[PDB]
Amino acid sequence: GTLGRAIYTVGNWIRGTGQALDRVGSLLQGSHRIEEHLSRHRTLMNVFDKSPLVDKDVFVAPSASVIGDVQIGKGSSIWYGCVLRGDVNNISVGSGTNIQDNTLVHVAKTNISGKVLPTLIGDNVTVGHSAVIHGCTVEDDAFVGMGATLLDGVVVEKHAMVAAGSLVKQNTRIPSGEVWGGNPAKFMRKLTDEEIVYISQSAKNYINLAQIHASENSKSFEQIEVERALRKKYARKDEDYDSMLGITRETPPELILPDNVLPGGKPV
Amino acid sequence: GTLGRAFYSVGFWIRETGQALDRLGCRLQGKNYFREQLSRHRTLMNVFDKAPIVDKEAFVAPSASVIGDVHIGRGSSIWYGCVLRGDVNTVSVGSGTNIQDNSLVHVAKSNLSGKVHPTIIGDNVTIGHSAVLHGCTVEDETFIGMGATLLDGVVVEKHGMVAAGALVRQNTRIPSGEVWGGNPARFLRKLTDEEIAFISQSATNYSNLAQAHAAENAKPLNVIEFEKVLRKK
Amino acid sequence: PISATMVGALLGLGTQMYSNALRKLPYMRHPWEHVVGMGLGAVFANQLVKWDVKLKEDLDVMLAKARAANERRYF
Amino acid sequence: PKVSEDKNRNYAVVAGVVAIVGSIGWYLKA
Amino acid sequence: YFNLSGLILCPVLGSIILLFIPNSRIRLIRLIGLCASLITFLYSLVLWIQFDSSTAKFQFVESLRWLPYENINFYLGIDGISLFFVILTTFLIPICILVGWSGMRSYGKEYIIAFLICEFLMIAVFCMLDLLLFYVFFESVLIPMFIIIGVWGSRQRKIKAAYQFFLYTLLGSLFMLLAILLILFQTGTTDLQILLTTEFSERRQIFLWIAFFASFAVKVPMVPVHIWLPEAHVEAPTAGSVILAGILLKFGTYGFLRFSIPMFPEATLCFTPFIYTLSAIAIIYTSLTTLRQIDLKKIIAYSSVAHMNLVTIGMFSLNIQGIGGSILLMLSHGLVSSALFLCVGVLYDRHKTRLVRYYGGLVSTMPNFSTIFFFFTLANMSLPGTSSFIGEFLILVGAFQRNSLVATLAALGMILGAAYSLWLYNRVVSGNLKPDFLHKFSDLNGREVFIFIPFLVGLVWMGVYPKVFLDCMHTSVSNLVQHGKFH
């Protein structure tokens, strides 16, 4: 009531004094420091009357930048720091195919070679971290290792792999079942069936892993504070005192990950 | 100098005291919105007096990080994900260039390796995607390929092209009109007239594209999105 | 000269900065508690001097009493 | 919204103000 | 008005300022440390100017209560004996700071801080006129020197040398502390001026004198206890050896001059043949063992034992030539020996070795170093025109007047001293080069040239006109010669 109003007015006075002190301290610094501003980074952006068509189930990290004509299929994911610039031409991302951290997918200027085609990425493909794609036509069920660079005009056929730290030269086709790699990107070896199983399992594991990141990066301020308080409360345990009190403190469901992302599916 | 640093630190102390007072005033009123974990990233960050100087007609992506004494010419562009960190020395970016997506142009972090060479970028210079320019220098109207890894002490002459993914070793000079590629970088072939014309046209194409990207980035922040984020149930 | 007020203020500032250093924090983390430490150090030093004077006076009185008690042995 | 709602927190603020004022008076009056 | 308070507080401020400076600012740390050392040196030089040389009373006296009944208190004062020691211990610190200038990025702020705390502790040692507090600052030097030896040692041997030095210093220290306590209980106080006017029973003079000798003889290694000095000296940084030999070896002789030669005039006379015997064989044995050493820093370290044992012959002669001439030798030794370790430090910093075998023919590649090294070789071998000869000859004429035999034995010290001093120079400097071992050279830089300049000037200035130093001491050393005498 009256006490609450008085305390509110005192708080207003204190806030005004604090802001004045902040301004004075900024003045003494010589106005050299560049003040932090509101985040102007747009996760999804338009360029020329063209909007991305990100599907409902896709996980697009807030630090990612999906720009221009980008079409992304269900179950796929775009991870932190990734850039998909489809301003000049089209970029189509298939279903279940994840583009990993700091990766760049860009499309040529439709005249880099005269007969340029849009960047097409098939289904259930996985692209490693820091990879660079500049006009490829990666077919479905393919693997691109982390750090690999795919120049314009290349096609990665189904069930083919590009070794990490490779450079596939322009107009180079990787046949099915090969592990083309190296800086010239020459033939290394044939793919074994275990490698194919590993590729499919990695794609499915990333589809499974994108969900917790999506559920964590979309929380509100109120939910974040509650989860932080719960995490602090259950960080350390004391079974002896609980046994003395006859209680059993159990971790809330907000701090429990699904068993399908644990190393071996641990129920307990 | 040393007199300026003392005033800078005292200003930090007073600003910290003022922020603490503001937080205390917020707590009396019951508000706790200062606890929000907002991103502290600044597209233009300074180190004491070393502040980037960006021309008005230059596109700098909001996610690009420019730190220290960095000079950007008119018509140049720093695209998304770029990190241009020059603190121990200066990073000079000319007019009409284009630091393309996820590229890195930085200077050496210590004097133990020797003398830190300032990074100089000419005019109409094309830097490929995810390319590292670590204390090198490039003349105007040159091309740096995708994934290139130029090191310090490297001079790339005018009309010189560095092939994609090539790693130019320390203290290497690329002669004018020659393409250097592979690991380590070695002479491969001589540039043709058509490639020179394409290199010249790419700079103008990216300069025009940067204007559209800046126009789409300078629009007022959407209030519908802000309201939707505010109410999440 | 060196008064108790200044040595107390220096000890308070030093113990504040020492506490901040022991926790891997910057020396001038919270300036307000540095000021509080300076004030508390000055107060404690002045009180210590004021207590020391009275303590010495009491010791002198008590030793006078003890010597007077011992001197009675010769009668 | 010019009202502080938490009654318990308001009493803590009043007690802190009273403690500060009493300490100042104690250091002044004696 | 320059007093002993400011001279002692200057290193305190210097060490406190660097204590709260970020380590990333390496330049600022070095500048502030060097400036503090130079300011302290100028303060000492000013204190020299206003020093009266006609009164035996202690000058610039300052008092600070320690016990509640003023039984023991901080009494600071200087006389003609300890003034030059203060000047030397304030002059050596900036040189030590300048030694580690290039490689200072790795040492950090803990290096200058340690050296400034060292300077603080050594200034108070030469200025204390209280027997107990002289012991407190006497043994407070261990911690900074222990840290210097251990943290910034050369090889893994630093753990052994630090342990050995610490153990020897402790065993001397506590056996001295028992005597100090017995003196305090009997007399009542520990003030030096009061302890010099109290008659000690003849039975108690021998015990107290022996107990004092136990601690002092360790820091002026006589014969049984000069085995810690070589190891701890070789396992030390270049600036660390300058402190150990420049000043830390002057505590024993100063302790004898201040607390032994006066508080027991009768005990000193009885033990005079004992000191003459130990010093005579130490000069003969050490100057002979020096010939068969192969380490560069282990040869000069053995050139100090012979020189410092020649000093204790001078002090116990109890005449103006002896006591007065022994002071000049320590000032000369503090400059000549500390300059030789700079020369070795120059060689070690470039070529990480100390064996004399690897060195030879440097006269053709490092000529400025050879010229400077030769000059201090001449000073180390007691050449006239150098500060060492004045002290060396004045001690001989002070001991010949008391005992002709001890002056004869001590005279063979310069026979052997001139043997290894030039023979080392011939090996290291003269001869043919050895490109198989070492082939890259660099003569003295700007720092090394400038660092040696005050040593060059201060060595001939004392060597050709020692009257400036001598006339400031005769009033103070003559009152020291006779204390119990009244005729």
Ligand SMILES: CCCCCCCCCCC(CCCCCCCCCC)(CO[C@H]1O[C@@H](CO)[C@H](O[C@@H]2O[C@@H](CO)[C@H](O)[C@@H](O)[C@@H]2O)[C@@H](O)[C@@H]1O)CO[C@H]1O[C@@H](CO)[C@H](O[C@@H]2O[C@@H](CO)[C@H](O)[C@@H](O)[C@@H]2O)[C@@H](O)[C@H]1O
């Ligand atoms: C660890 C740091 C080491 C620093 C010490 C060396 C530096 C020198 C400063 C030492 C210092 C501060 C002590 C700091 C305490 C440390 C802080 C503890 C932690 C704090 C976080 C005390 O030092 C003086 O105090 C005197 C006691 O008064 C004592 O003199 C003996 O007393 C007799 C007994 O009765 C003995 O019989 C007799 O033999 C001696 O005369 C001596 O101790 C000494 O002279 C400086 O003096 C300070 O106190 C007094 C002066 O007295 C001053 O104010 C006084 O107030 C009234 C008296 O209450 C007086 O009416 C008033 O007139 C006077 O103005 C101060 O303005 C200031 O000058």
Ligand SMILES: CCCCC/C=C/C/C=C\C/C=C/C/C=C/CCCC(=O)O[C@H](COC(=O)CCCCCCCCCCCCCCCCC)COP(=O)(O)O[C@H]1[C@H](O)[C@H](O)[C@@H](O)[C@H](O)[C@H]1O
């Ligand atoms: C530029 C020149 C000036 C430059 C100088 C400027 C000076 C500004 C004036 C006064 C500065 C006052 C300094 C006093 C500061 C005291 C410490 C602040 C204490 C404080 O957390 O606040 C109240 C607490 O309530 C009290 O339990 C105890 C709090 C009682 C004390 C609060 C009363 C403050 C009123 C001061 C009078 C203002 C009169 C007007 C002043 C403005 C002038 C117009 C908020 O509780 P809370 O539950 O919401 O939250 C707290 C808080 O977040 C943290 O302490 C913990 O993390 C948390 O666990 C919880 O404890």
Ligand SMILES: CCCCCCCCCCCCCCCCCCCC(=O)O[C@H](COC(=O)CCCCCCCCCCCCCC)COP(=O)(O)OCCN
């Ligand atoms: C004596 C030689 C000379 C030394 C120099 C003396 C100088 C005078 C003293 C200067 C002291 C400077 C201190 C400046 C004020 C800072 C105090 C702020 C503490 C505070 O805000 O309260 C909470 C903790 O309380 C606390 O931290 C209280 C800690 C108190 C510990 C000791 C309590 C008294 C014990 C009796 C004396 C000790 C034994 C002596 C025989 C902070 O909470 P938070 O935000 O940090 O987070 C949770 C951590 N809990």
Ligand SMILES: CCCCCC(=O)OC[C@H](COP(=O)(O)OC[C@H](N)C(=O)O)OC(=O)CCCCC
């Ligand atoms: C004049 C400014 C008073 C500002 C009062 C104030 O902020 O108290 C909080 C501080 C630190 O306590 P917190 O961990 O809750 O940080 C809370 C922190 N504000 C934060 O943002 O996290 O308390 C002190 O140490 C100071 C004790 C001496 C208080 C006089």
Ligand SMILES: [Zn+2]
């Ligand atoms: Zn591109």
